[PDB]
């Protein structure tokens, strides 16, 4: 039984970063050549693991996180990064083991008029913990005190990406998939094609 990476990388719709989505990949044969033989990836890099050697490895479990970010924000999807994406939307652990893949999706995520369906959080009281997710949409106050706009000093915590088919590449939309490699003291559930 092949691991369902197609369902992940080829999903018709992708979520916003702040509402990032995780699929558990487990108990299956991972044929990573599907990512080798597709040559559209503009980010493809791994931590604790050689990117080209994935078919030779077994993992306890693989987690696939999908979301969309601005081109210039892709770099925040790494261990130890700072910034509003990495501190308020999606944070990888210092000791991350896995891979980050990204590809330019101008032709399906951007528009002449501008696509504003994709959002990120930019106001928050305290940074996210690694792999933590915050999908609330609560008026934000620097007092921390609850507030009801139009009250003063009361702000909305999300903001839109505006994805236009005519901007520079750093502003165009990128679909991101993070693969987390879990290592436990047991048999492995996700192995490569000829490993058992």
């Amino acid at each position: 039984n092949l691991c369902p990476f197609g369902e992940v990388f080829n999903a018709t719709k992708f979520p916003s970063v702040y509402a990032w989505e995780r699929k558990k990949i487990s108990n299956c044969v991972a044929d990573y050549s599907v990512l080798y033989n597709s040559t559209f990836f503009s980010t493809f890099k791994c931590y604790g693991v050689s990117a080209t050697k994935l078919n030779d490895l077994c993992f306890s479990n693989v987690y696939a996180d999908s979301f969309v970010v601005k081109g210039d924000d892709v770099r925040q999807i790494a261990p130890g990064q700072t910034g509003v994406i990495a501190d308020y939307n999606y944070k990888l652990p210092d000791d991350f083991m896995g891979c980050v893949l990204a590809w330019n999706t101008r032709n399906i995520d951007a528009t002449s008029t501008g696509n504003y369906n994709y959002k990120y959080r930019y106001l928050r009281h305290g940074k996210l913990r690694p792999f933590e997710r915050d999908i609330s949409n609560v008026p934000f106050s620097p007092d921390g005190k609850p507030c009801t706009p139009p009250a003063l000093n009361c702000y909305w915590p999300l903001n839109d990406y505006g994805f236009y088919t005519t901007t520079g590449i750093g502003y165009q939309p990128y679909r991101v998939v993070v693969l987390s490699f879990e290592l436990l003291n047991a048999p492995a559930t996700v192995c490569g094609p000829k490993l058992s």
Partner: nanobody
Amino acid sequence: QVQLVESGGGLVQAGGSLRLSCVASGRTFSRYAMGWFRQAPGKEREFVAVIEWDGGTSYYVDSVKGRFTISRDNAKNTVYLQMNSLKPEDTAVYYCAAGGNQYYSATYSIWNEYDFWGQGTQVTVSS
């Protein structure tokens, strides 16, 4: 955040040798491919060398093949750049960089493709 501190730079006569070191903080050093870049006067940061997380694969810019050799010690959180047969062309600030193990080797030579960067150590090779 992982911090990178270079050392071993300094002043050396043409024909001589230096050995640069870069120490990372934390315990996560062995996840990363470790690179060296350099910046000569009037030039962009240029790739010099990389070694992957496990020490087994490594690449060099052509102008240093056979003179420079990169190595690492995951036990000491330290990447090394052995520099022989130095020439004035090697005069530059040498920067350590930490990033992911890349699927395309060419990506290793793009400074912006790494995750962390040192503040550099100066190397001057006098004629």
